[PDB]
Design a protein around this ligand. Sequence first.
Ligand code: 8HO
Lengths: 10, 243
Amino acid sequence: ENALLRYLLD
Amino acid sequence: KPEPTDEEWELIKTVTEAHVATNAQGSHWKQKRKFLPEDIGQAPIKVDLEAFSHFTKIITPAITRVVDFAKKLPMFCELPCEDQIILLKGCCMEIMSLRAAVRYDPESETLTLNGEMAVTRGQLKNGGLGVVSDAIFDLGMSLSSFNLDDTEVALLQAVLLMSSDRPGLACVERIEKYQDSFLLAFEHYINYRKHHVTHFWPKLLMKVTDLRMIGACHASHFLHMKVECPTELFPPLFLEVFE
Ligand SMILES: Cc1nc(C(=O)NCC(=O)O)c(O)c2ccc(Oc3ccccc3)cc12
């Protein structure tokens, strides 16, 4: 659900 | 009073470098500083929409720098992904406030956000933060006497990031091991620095609590902003971190 924050954590 | 071990010096090099590399505008933050115009952020007639949109537009890079900090910490990287997400959502507002508070300027009575934007107690208050504005400004005023350097700020951020009490964490004992290491390095560095304040370490621990209050408040003032602004009006990275 934290799509963007997950992406930023690579 | 004991000073850092070699392992603790190495750890202090790591956090300090992580912090310096991710602190907006670095040494130049007072030069790149634009004072937000004074008509922006005066008291309505609730939330001043103009100041809100300026604050809305800089929260995203500020959250991203916090993420960049955590990623340059090797202990953080060994945590599973959901732990990292939980730990970041937990400490993002805490670390941003610390980073703003140590940039309090008593002559102008402003904080600098994003290395670039000087705002007043009234502007940050009327742009959505409410009483939390006073909390961050009061913290800045009182930190001036603590003369924190880059390393003490870095270590404070690591202590807040490594909080094993956030709801949902798998590796709770692992995270508390990491925090304990930082707390020990932090104390021994404080012993070595020999500040000229009595019981510096106990007083700094109360500052940690002040920050954890600012962080726990952002729920009571997330709702205070969603009274007026539809959820579309916030940037997405902010919504993720704050709910
Ligand atoms: C608490 C803090 N801090 C910083 C910041 O830059 N701190 C220093 C730094 O990271 O270098 C911000 O940029 C903030 C931006 C918005 C904000 O709330 C709001 C978010 C959306 C709408 C209104 C206020 C709090 C900030």
